[PDB]
């Protein structure tokens, strides 16, 4: 394949196999990773060398609940204090029902999570589909609404009434 | 110290709500001393909790350390245990804390409640000194919230959800086991002698299920086999712990240099004397193997062991099968060639 045995790329090959921690091999009909999409996505979590909250954030951004179920939520992951709460908040803003269900199943309690400030933040988000809440708030206030107005829970009570 | 503790009255009983996973699970709980008489415990379990007398008792023993089971084995084990405990009115005695085989029983119960009706009377007898929150549970006869989230650095473990009732036994210590084995054995002995509704004279059958294990599982198996009424046991081969060692020892009954597993204090310390005593009383040991042998179903393995292990006559086996409302067990075991009915 090359210029006989006189020319070889074995030095480069042995350097690559010395750094074989990142190399992933997909073998058809083999032990693990029979799917290409699973082989690619699982390599991005191990190869990132980040913490569990960062892996959960990546899986939440990719909207892949099976990757987080089979890799991130495993035996003894040692989540930092206050990480699952922020993960639940991010999944709640981005309209990720599967991730909310998975996080509720995997430890978080909605009674301690939901506070007045968190609900206020949830009512003033931008990540999500279109909604007519701002028009209703403007209509209840009879106009004269300053730009970049934070919607308080009192206005939400008024619009509910 | 030499157990110089204050004999104060109990101050924590009622119902706990497991805030956490996506289930609305209630669980009665009391805290009692480890010297409590089994008669009062049975009285409280029968009248204060409105639990009818069981037709069967299943005792689960396993390793304290959190092990993992391979796939395609824990699924059939859980399905068989759930089917045996649901088709028959029975109680399941477990450790209670979310460690070891108790987690397997918990997920087996979790996977059953999502597809079928009915409830299983799972009872956890756990020491009081290992709960992650000794507080937040002291409300007498009132609902107490409980959190299922676990912190690995807390050096304790959380109470396992999907359990119907809890019996918390304390000897005054905190952070150590050994405060519930004697009480659990005494309660099993007292409920075994309790009389079933049939007027033949037979009591509640008791079986033992062994998954994983350790240096003390062989001892508890031996003390089960040495009881005045013998208690049949059922072990599994795919666990890898002393249950697997006992399953291997089931082959070639009655090889001593094969005991070196780097699991005890070299070859100088061995449990082979109690192991060979158990294998000498191997007439009641039952091994469940997938594909290699018969009895591929856990519920069939448990129920058929209770008829052979009872060592009673055919009318008593028929009465037991009638009480359990299992017609297939009576069809396949009791009604065979040459049974000599009185």
From Swiss-Prot, chain B:
Give the intrachain disulfide bonds. Answer: none
User: Under what name is this protein listed?
Assistant: Transient receptor potential cation channel subfamily M member 3
**Subunit relationships:** Homotetramer. Interacts with TRPM1; the interaction results in the formation of a heteromultimeric cation channel complex that are functionally different from the homomeric channels.
Organism's domain of life? Answer: Eukaryota
UniProt function note: Constitutively active, non-selective divalent cation-conducting channel that is permeable to Ca(2+), Mn(2+), and Mg(2+), with a high permeability for Ca(2+). However, can be enhanced by increasing temperature and by ligands, including the endogenous neurosteroid pregnenolone sulfate and sphingosine-1 and suppressed by intracellular Mg(2+). Implicated in a variety of cellular processes, including insulin/peptide secretion, vascular constriction and dilation, noxious heat sensing, inflammatory and spontaneous pain sensitivity.
Q: Which residues of the full protein are shown?
A: 127 to 507 of 1732
Effect of knocking it out? Trpm3-deficient mice exhibit clear deficits in their avoidance to noxious heat. Trpm3-deficient mice display reduced hypersensitivity to thermal, but not to mechanical, stimuli in carrageen-induced inflammatory pain. In the chronic constriction injury (CCI) model of neuropathic pain, intraperitoneal injection of isosakuranetin or primidone do not reduced heat sensitivity in Trpm3-deficient mice.
Protein family membership: Belongs to the transient receptor (TC 1.A.4) family. LTrpC subfamily. TRPM3 sub-subfamily.
Q: Where is this region: Calmodulin-binding?
A: 66-89, 174-197
What species is given as this protein's source?
Answer: Mus musculus (Mouse)
Q: According to the UniProt record, what happens if one changes residue 83 to A/P/G?
A: Reduces calmodulin-binding by more than 50%
Effect of substituting residue 79 to A/P/G: Reduces calmodulin-binding by more than 50%
Please state where this protein is localized.
Cell membrane
Tell me what the record says results from residue 74 to A/P/G.
Reduces calmodulin-binding by more than 50%
């Amino acid at each position: 394949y090359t210029r006989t045995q006189a020319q070889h790329l074995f030095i480069i090959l042995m350097e690559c196999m010395k750094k074989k921690e990142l190399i992933t091999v997909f073998r058809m009909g083999s032990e693990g990773h029979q799917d290409i999409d699973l082989a690619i996505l699982t390599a991005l979590l191990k190869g990132a060398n980040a913490s569990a909250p960062d892996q959960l954030s990546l899986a939440l951004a990719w909207n892949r609940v099976d990757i987080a179920r089979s890799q991130i939520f495993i035996y003894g992951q040692q989540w930092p204090v206050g990480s699952l709460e922020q993960a639940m908040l991010d999944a709640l803003v981005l309209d990720r029902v599967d991730f909310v269900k998975l996080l509720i199943e995997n430890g978080v309690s909605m009674h301690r999570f939901l506070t007045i400030s968190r609900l206020e933040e949830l009512y003033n988000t931008r990540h999500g589909p279109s909604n007519t809440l701002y028009h209703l708030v403007r209509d209840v206030k009879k106009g004269n609404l300053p730009p970049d107005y934070r919607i308080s829970l009192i206005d939400i009570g008024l619009v509910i009434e | 110290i030499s157990k110089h503790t204050q004999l104060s009255p109990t101050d924590a009983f009622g119902t706990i709500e497991f805030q956490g996973g996506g289930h609305s699970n209630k669980a009665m709980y009391v805290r009692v001393s480890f010297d409590t008489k089994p008669d009062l415990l049975l009285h409280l379990m029968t009248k204060e909790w409105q639990l009818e007398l069981p037709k069967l008792l299943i005792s689960v023993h396993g390793g304290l350390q959190n092990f993992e089971l391979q796939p395609k084995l824990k699924q059939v084990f859980g399905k068989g245990l759930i089917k045996a405990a649901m088709t028959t009115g029975a109680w399941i005695f477990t450790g209670g804390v979310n460690t070891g085989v108790i987690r397997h029983v918990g997920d087996a119960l979790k996977d059953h409640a999502s597809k079928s009706r009915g409830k299983i009377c799972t009872i956890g007898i756990a020491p009081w000194g290992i709960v992650e929150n000794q507080e937040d549970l002291i409300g007498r006869d009132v609902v107490r919230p409980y959190q299922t989230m676990s912190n690995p650095m807390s050096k304790l473990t959380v109470l396992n959800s999907m359990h119907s009732h809890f019996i918390l036994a304390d000897n005054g210590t905190t952070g150590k086991y050994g405060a519930e084995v004697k009480l659990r054995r005494q309660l099993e002995k007292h409920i075994s002698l309790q009389k079933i509704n049939t007027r033949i004279g037979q009591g509640v059958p008791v079986v033992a299920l062994i998954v994983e294990g350790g240096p003390n599982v062989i001892s508890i198996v031996l003390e089960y086999l040495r009881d005045t009424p013998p208690v049949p046991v059922v072990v599994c081969d795919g666990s890898g712990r002393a249950s697997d060692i006992l399953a291997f020892g089931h082959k070639y009954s009655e090889v001593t240099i094969q005991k070196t597993f780097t699991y005890t204090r070299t070859q100088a310390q061995h449990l082979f004397i109690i192991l060979m005593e158990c294998m000498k009383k191997k007439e009641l040991i039952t091994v469940f193997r997938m594909g290699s042998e018969g009895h591929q179903d856990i519920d069939l393995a448990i129920l058929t062991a209770l008829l052979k292990g009872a060592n009673a006559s055919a009318p008593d086996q028929l009465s037991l099968a009638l009480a359990w409302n299992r017609v297939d067990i009576a069809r396949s075991q009791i009604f065979i060639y040459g049974q000599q009915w009185p």
